[PDB]
Design a protein around this ligand. Structure first.
Ligand SMILES: [K+]
Ligand SMILES: [K+]
Ligand SMILES: [K+]
Ligand SMILES: [K+]
Ligand SMILES: [K+]
Ligand SMILES: [K+]
Ligand SMILES: [K+]
Ligand SMILES: [K+]
Ligand SMILES: [K+]
Ligand SMILES: [K+]
Ligand SMILES: [K+]
Ligand SMILES: [K+]
Ligand SMILES: [K+]
Ligand SMILES: [K+]
Ligand SMILES: [K+]
Ligand SMILES: [K+]
Ligand SMILES: [K+]
Ligand SMILES: [K+]
Ligand SMILES: [K+]
Ligand SMILES: [K+]
Ligand SMILES: [K+]
Ligand SMILES: [K+]
Ligand SMILES: [K+]
Ligand SMILES: [K+]
Ligand SMILES: [K+]
Ligand SMILES: [K+]
Ligand SMILES: [Mg+2]
Ligand SMILES: [Mg+2]
Ligand SMILES: [Mg+2]
Ligand SMILES: [Mg+2]
Ligand SMILES: [Mg+2]
Ligand SMILES: [Mg+2]
Ligand SMILES: [Mg+2]
Ligand SMILES: [Mg+2]
Ligand SMILES: [Mg+2]
Ligand SMILES: [Mg+2]
Ligand SMILES: [Mg+2]
Ligand SMILES: [Mg+2]
Ligand SMILES: [Mg+2]
Ligand SMILES: [Mg+2]
Ligand SMILES: [Mg+2]
Ligand SMILES: [Mg+2]
Ligand SMILES: [Mg+2]
Ligand SMILES: [Mg+2]
Ligand SMILES: [Mg+2]
Ligand SMILES: [Mg+2]
Ligand SMILES: [Mg+2]
Ligand SMILES: [Mg+2]
Ligand SMILES: [Mg+2]
Ligand SMILES: [Mg+2]
Ligand SMILES: [Mg+2]
Ligand SMILES: [Mg+2]
Ligand SMILES: [Mg+2]
Ligand SMILES: [Mg+2]
Ligand SMILES: [Mg+2]
Ligand SMILES: [Mg+2]
Ligand SMILES: [Mg+2]
Ligand SMILES: [Mg+2]
Ligand SMILES: [Mg+2]
Ligand SMILES: [Mg+2]
Ligand SMILES: [Mg+2]
Ligand SMILES: [Mg+2]
Ligand SMILES: [Mg+2]
Ligand SMILES: [Mg+2]
Ligand SMILES: [Mg+2]
Ligand SMILES: [Mg+2]
Ligand SMILES: [Mg+2]
Ligand SMILES: [Mg+2]
Ligand SMILES: [Mg+2]
Ligand SMILES: [Mg+2]
Ligand SMILES: [Mg+2]
Ligand SMILES: [Mg+2]
Ligand SMILES: [Mg+2]
Ligand SMILES: [Mg+2]
Ligand SMILES: [Mg+2]
Ligand SMILES: [Mg+2]
Ligand SMILES: [Mg+2]
Ligand SMILES: [Mg+2]
Ligand SMILES: [Mg+2]
Ligand SMILES: [Mg+2]
Ligand SMILES: [Mg+2]
Ligand SMILES: [Mg+2]
Ligand SMILES: [Mg+2]
Ligand SMILES: [Mg+2]
Ligand SMILES: [Mg+2]
Ligand SMILES: [Mg+2]
Ligand SMILES: [Mg+2]
Ligand SMILES: [Mg+2]
Ligand SMILES: [Mg+2]
Ligand SMILES: [Mg+2]
Ligand SMILES: [Mg+2]
Ligand SMILES: [Mg+2]
Ligand SMILES: [Mg+2]
Ligand SMILES: [Mg+2]
Ligand SMILES: [Mg+2]
Ligand SMILES: [Mg+2]
Ligand SMILES: [Mg+2]
Ligand SMILES: [Mg+2]
Ligand SMILES: [Mg+2]
Ligand SMILES: [Mg+2]
Ligand SMILES: [Mg+2]
Ligand SMILES: [Mg+2]
Ligand SMILES: [Mg+2]
Ligand SMILES: [Mg+2]
Ligand SMILES: [Mg+2]
Ligand SMILES: [Mg+2]
Ligand SMILES: [Mg+2]
Ligand SMILES: [Mg+2]
Ligand SMILES: [Mg+2]
Ligand SMILES: [Mg+2]
Ligand SMILES: [Mg+2]
Ligand SMILES: [Mg+2]
Ligand SMILES: [Mg+2]
Ligand SMILES: [Mg+2]
Ligand SMILES: [Mg+2]
Ligand SMILES: [Mg+2]
Ligand SMILES: [Mg+2]
Ligand SMILES: [Mg+2]
Ligand SMILES: [Mg+2]
Ligand SMILES: [Mg+2]
Ligand SMILES: [Mg+2]
Ligand SMILES: [Mg+2]
Ligand SMILES: [Mg+2]
Ligand SMILES: [Mg+2]
Ligand SMILES: [Mg+2]
Ligand SMILES: [Mg+2]
Ligand SMILES: [Mg+2]
Ligand SMILES: [Mg+2]
Ligand SMILES: [Mg+2]
Ligand SMILES: [Mg+2]
Lengths: 146, 96
RNA sequence: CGCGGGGUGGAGCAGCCUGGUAGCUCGUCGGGCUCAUAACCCGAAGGUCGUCGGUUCAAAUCCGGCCCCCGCAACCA
RNA sequence: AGCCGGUAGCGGGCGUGGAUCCCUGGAUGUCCGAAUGGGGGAACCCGGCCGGCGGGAACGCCGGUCACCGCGCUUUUUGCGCGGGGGGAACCUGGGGAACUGAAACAUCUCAGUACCCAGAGGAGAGGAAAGAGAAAUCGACUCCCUGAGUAGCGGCGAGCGAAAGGGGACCAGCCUAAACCGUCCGGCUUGUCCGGGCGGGGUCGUGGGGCCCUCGGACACCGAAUCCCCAGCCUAGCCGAA
RNA sequence: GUGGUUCGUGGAGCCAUGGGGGAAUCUGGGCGGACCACCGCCUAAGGCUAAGUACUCCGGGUGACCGAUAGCGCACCAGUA
RNA sequence: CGUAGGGAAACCGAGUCCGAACAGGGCGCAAACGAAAAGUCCGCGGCCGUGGACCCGAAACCGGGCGAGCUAGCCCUGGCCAGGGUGAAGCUGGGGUGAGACCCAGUGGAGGCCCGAACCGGUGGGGGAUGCAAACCCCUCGGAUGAGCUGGGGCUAGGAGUGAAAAGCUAACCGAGCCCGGAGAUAGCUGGUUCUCCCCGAAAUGACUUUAGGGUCAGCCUCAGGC
RNA sequence: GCGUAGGGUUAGGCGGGACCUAAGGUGAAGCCGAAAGGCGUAGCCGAAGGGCAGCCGGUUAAUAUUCCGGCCCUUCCCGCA
RNA sequence: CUGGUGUUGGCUCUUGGUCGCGCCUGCGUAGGAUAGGUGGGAGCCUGUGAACCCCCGCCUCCGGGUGGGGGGGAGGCGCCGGUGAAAUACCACCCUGGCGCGGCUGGGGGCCUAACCCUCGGAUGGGGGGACAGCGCUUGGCGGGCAGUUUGACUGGGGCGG
RNA sequence: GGGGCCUGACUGCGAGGCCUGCAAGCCGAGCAGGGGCGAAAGCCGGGCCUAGUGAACCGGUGGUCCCGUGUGGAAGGGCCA
């Protein structure tokens, strides 16, 4: 009695691998409680259609990111701060770095989730990382002209 | 209907109860005899299958042999209208 | 005929397990105690432990047919 | 050339401007009956609605309409639409299914799948294009007749029961579909090259056939109904017909 | 577990089928009277199909068929009194 | 059908079977001088099989229906029981006693109580017996406020019903109703069986028989053909 | 009380129906049964029970709470207050 | 009345059967003693660990066997040497019963609820029973409640007797 | 009745008859195979004789050339006992 599940069930497991069980369980507890369907050839085909429908986008969400994450480690954005010496009068945060990338090369960001705790003062040299799941490091120089 | 399967059309048949005294001739058995032969009905193993289809519950009297046929008919779902006499549709018009 | 189990002292039962005690019981004999007798205690007698043929240190304690009763449903032109 | 039934009579009428009578169609067809608006002790009783009639509101009459079921439509039927009810001498298929009797008793057996009960069909019904037969590299759908044959067998191997292949004849035709792949419409959705139900295409064979590709040049020439159409023919009244 | 077939359990196959288990799509499947091989014949699980056949309420024809106790129960207002 | 028979069969064949057998035996094979005939095919006749099989007749069996307007029970609803007699409980009054029980009067009017009509019965006797009557008449007798009788409307039935129980009753006969059907059931039994003449002319014994008053074989009668 | 023929039964109030329910019957919902069919709450059918308005006389060969005489009531419909 | 199954599910606790690998127990003086069968048989065993002690757990003809923590700082054992059939080191095959693990599994006892059943003026719901009951197929049994029949002949009638 | 070697309580048949309704029952010489006892002639196919028994069907067993449902087998039958 092969049924395709919906959620975990602890030995008779999780979100949709298939497994068969005693037929009484199925037609009185598993399908009536709306947490499985038997593996009709159509439903057996519909799942496999939606296994790749996700796993291609999963293979794509992890292709959308590492396409940008690959054309990002080739640039370098400058930050020409009114900065005096070795210390910024203002500061640079993510939102401002977004502004930098948005028009020094024309790219947008979250800007959140950028390894920026306590936005960076203090002219110098910095290399920060980014997201999604596999992620990208980015370098950027903070400089000073009027 | 009357002790019949709604899905298989299987209905009670007539068989004979045959009482036999004797050893099987295939056992050094001078012969099997027959003491009585009378009429008996064999009844299909009928059971209630109670399924909640779109609106209300739907109750079948199916031969236990054809029980999954109900749940494969439960698959077909469209026309979420009137009373518990949807089987009119779930029936032969599915299979026809 | 075929299967399950039996045949240990004059009566029966444990030893038929993992081959190295043949004993128990009542019954009969001599004896002690009781007027006594049953009782009780003591000792002694009766067993080739169903047959043969073997595996082996040894076997009643394993086997195979045998042989009788009891046991088994079954069976009948 | 007479007619107003069996049937005369009284008392009246019609017919060569073709009566009566016979054939075809049509109209009227009270009530009951599947009986169907609702009851009901068949041939009676009581209504709703729309229209009508009378002085007509009450009462009444008239015409029309209104049972239930299935099915297809559709907006869950508030409606419409077609269909079904019941009868029939025997014949027909199916679903059930005796006994006396025979066995010179009786139980297997027989009578027998008979009598009979029920459901369905029609002018026939059943059956019918091989998952067939069965020894001949063999027949070719089914039904019926004749033979095979009282053979093969079945059997308290008792009483009894009893085939088939083949052969000769009657008649003689085979056709749709589901499925793969294509289109599609609505659907549902964990939107998709997905599933799915309704329709259209396709395709139907045992030497295997089909689908999707590949090459070929294949052709409308030929085929052609069991469906519709016309016709001869026939049935439903008659007529001529020697001496 | 039974029915059907000549087959009454018989060496009992074949066609049906109430119960249980439960496939495959050509290298797949059923059958040739248990079962095995070989050699063969067939394509199951969807459906229709005239004609040749049966009967006789009805109409007509024919008779080594009756002739009013016969012939249908009824020749006559009989399924009546 | 006949022309080929023997063998359980494999088979063989004017033979084959059993058998070591060329002993044996079983069952088989064999022209009368162109006529006649094996064999078949029609027709007629005797007999048998199978069919209702010479006719009439059961007691019964089973199938499908029809019946509770009779009778039995119960359900619903109505109705009827003259008139008399006995006189329970309980009240009430009084006596009683510590308070009681209890005793006594009057009242009261209970009961499958009493005598007895209607009504329901049917004890004894007589009559009746092709009746007035397929259960009646007369005399006598039982019950008669109860388990009472009764009108109407209802339900239950054939191996079933109903039954204060007799195997009673279920439409004038119930140890299993009626009708139609299977059906011409079966009847080793009883009865019956039709013109005329002519010749022959028995037996009632034996053997076996769930047989004895039935049969099968033999015996005894008859006919045809042959010796 | 027979044959032939003619005549004879008059109802808003009497009985029953255009009221009610009882046993019982039937029966949508529903349940069951090889078929025929069997059950079944509701609803409906069902009366000698419930409900409901007519009493006395006269008349006819034959009908009268029915026709007539007198007195007396019931429902519906429509008006007004 | 009953067994096996279908309808018929969850979580557990528990045993039985078989099989395969591993581990094993078996003892009358008796080559030296407390060796299961027989075959092999000049020797092993210790390097990261040998005897004796530490205590643990198991078995006990309680003698002794045996594995684990270790103290452990290395010989412990072998046979010939027979007053027992056999010889006790060792690595195996295998019987015996046993434990364990794993596989295959049948039998039990619980608890659960969601089938199924019963209920609840109220319900795709609640309560109770509960995978039992019931019902389908099947196995065996009790079974005059009912059905179909049988229950001989001869015979100084029949019966009884014979 | 007593000894002695022996097993013919043989296999294959059986002319011819007793008896007899059938079906049975009974006696039997002789021929062939191979034997036993006897010198041999000859005897022997149980017992001095007449009772000690059961058709057929259904199976069991042991063998055997036979049949074996398309074919080789197998199932199962037949044949002798
Ligand atoms: K269910
Ligand atoms: K004319
Ligand atoms: K009307
Ligand atoms: K029939
Ligand atoms: K019978
Ligand atoms: K008879
Ligand atoms: K009889
Ligand atoms: K038959
Ligand atoms: K199509
Ligand atoms: K599609
Ligand atoms: K068969
Ligand atoms: K088949
Ligand atoms: K075939
Ligand atoms: K074939
Ligand atoms: K047809
Ligand atoms: K006459
Ligand atoms: K007549
Ligand atoms: K000869
Ligand atoms: K004859
Ligand atoms: K009866
Ligand atoms: K009658
Ligand atoms: K009722
Ligand atoms: K009334
Ligand atoms: K519930
Ligand atoms: K159960
Ligand atoms: K006498
Ligand atoms: Mg299961
Ligand atoms: Mg049975
Ligand atoms: Mg029977
Ligand atoms: Mg019978
Ligand atoms: Mg199944
Ligand atoms: Mg005139
Ligand atoms: Mg006309
Ligand atoms: Mg009129
Ligand atoms: Mg009607
Ligand atoms: Mg009507
Ligand atoms: Mg009414
Ligand atoms: Mg009007
Ligand atoms: Mg008007
Ligand atoms: Mg009208
Ligand atoms: Mg009208
Ligand atoms: Mg109409
Ligand atoms: Mg009809
Ligand atoms: Mg009808
Ligand atoms: Mg019709
Ligand atoms: Mg039939
Ligand atoms: Mg039918
Ligand atoms: Mg008879
Ligand atoms: Mg036809
Ligand atoms: Mg033949
Ligand atoms: Mg025939
Ligand atoms: Mg053809
Ligand atoms: Mg299509
Ligand atoms: Mg097409
Ligand atoms: Mg191909
Ligand atoms: Mg003329
Ligand atoms: Mg003329
Ligand atoms: Mg049969
Ligand atoms: Mg059969
Ligand atoms: Mg098969
Ligand atoms: Mg086969
Ligand atoms: Mg074959
Ligand atoms: Mg087909
Ligand atoms: Mg057809
Ligand atoms: Mg004549
Ligand atoms: Mg004449
Ligand atoms: Mg007549
Ligand atoms: Mg005359
Ligand atoms: Mg007429
Ligand atoms: Mg001869
Ligand atoms: Mg009947
Ligand atoms: Mg009555
Ligand atoms: Mg009565
Ligand atoms: Mg009175
Ligand atoms: Mg009085
Ligand atoms: Mg009185
Ligand atoms: Mg009294
Ligand atoms: Mg009295
Ligand atoms: Mg009376
Ligand atoms: Mg009486
Ligand atoms: Mg009297
Ligand atoms: Mg008298
Ligand atoms: Mg009196
Ligand atoms: Mg008195
Ligand atoms: Mg009295
Ligand atoms: Mg009373
Ligand atoms: Mg009464
Ligand atoms: Mg009545
Ligand atoms: Mg009846
Ligand atoms: Mg009857
Ligand atoms: Mg009584
Ligand atoms: Mg009577
Ligand atoms: Mg008959
Ligand atoms: Mg008769
Ligand atoms: Mg008889
Ligand atoms: Mg003479
Ligand atoms: Mg006589
Ligand atoms: Mg007789
Ligand atoms: Mg004779
Ligand atoms: Mg002569
Ligand atoms: Mg008069
Ligand atoms: Mg008169
Ligand atoms: Mg009036
Ligand atoms: Mg008036
Ligand atoms: Mg009216
Ligand atoms: Mg009424
Ligand atoms: Mg009413
Ligand atoms: Mg009813
Ligand atoms: Mg009244
Ligand atoms: Mg009134
Ligand atoms: Mg008045
Ligand atoms: Mg008056
Ligand atoms: Mg009068
Ligand atoms: Mg008046
Ligand atoms: Mg199942
Ligand atoms: Mg519980
Ligand atoms: Mg619940
Ligand atoms: Mg009995
Ligand atoms: Mg009896
Ligand atoms: Mg009988
Ligand atoms: Mg007997
Ligand atoms: Mg006698
Ligand atoms: Mg006598
Ligand atoms: Mg006697
Ligand atoms: Mg006797
Ligand atoms: Mg002779
Ligand atoms: Mg010699
Ligand atoms: Mg016999
Ligand atoms: Mg052979
Ligand atoms: Mg063969």
């Amino acid at each position: 009695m092969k049924v395709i599940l919906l959620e975990p069930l602890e030995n008779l497991g999780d979100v949709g691998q298939v497994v068969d069980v005693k037929p009484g369980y199925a037609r009185n507890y598993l399908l009536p409680r709306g947490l499985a369907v038997l593996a009709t050839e159509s439903n057996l085909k519909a799942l496999e259609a939606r296994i790749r429908a996700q796993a291609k986008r999963l293979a794509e969400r992890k292709a959308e990111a590492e396409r940008l994450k690959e054309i990002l480690e080739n640039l370098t954005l400058t930050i020409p701060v009114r900065a005096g010496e070795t210390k910024i009068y203002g500061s640079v945060t993510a939102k401002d770095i977004a502004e930098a990338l948005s028009r020094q090369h024309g790219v947008t960001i979250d800007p959140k989730r950028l390894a920026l705790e306590k936005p960076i003062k203090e002219l110098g040299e910095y290399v920060l990382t980014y997201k999604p799941h596999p992620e990208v490091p980015i370098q950027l120089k903070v400089s000073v002209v009027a | 209907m009357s002790k019949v399967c709604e899905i298989s059309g299987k209905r009670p048949i007539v068989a004979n109860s045959i009482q036999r005294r004797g050893k099987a001739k295939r056992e050094g058995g001078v012969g099997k005899k027959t003491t009585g032969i009378s009429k008996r009905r064999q009844y299909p193993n009928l059971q209630k299958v109670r399924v909640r289809v779109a609106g209300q519950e739907i109750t079948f009297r199916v031969a236990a042999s054809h029980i999954p046929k109900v749940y494969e008919l439960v698959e077909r779902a469209k026309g979420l209208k009137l009373e518990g006499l949807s089987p009119k549709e779930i029936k032969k018009e599915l299979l026809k």
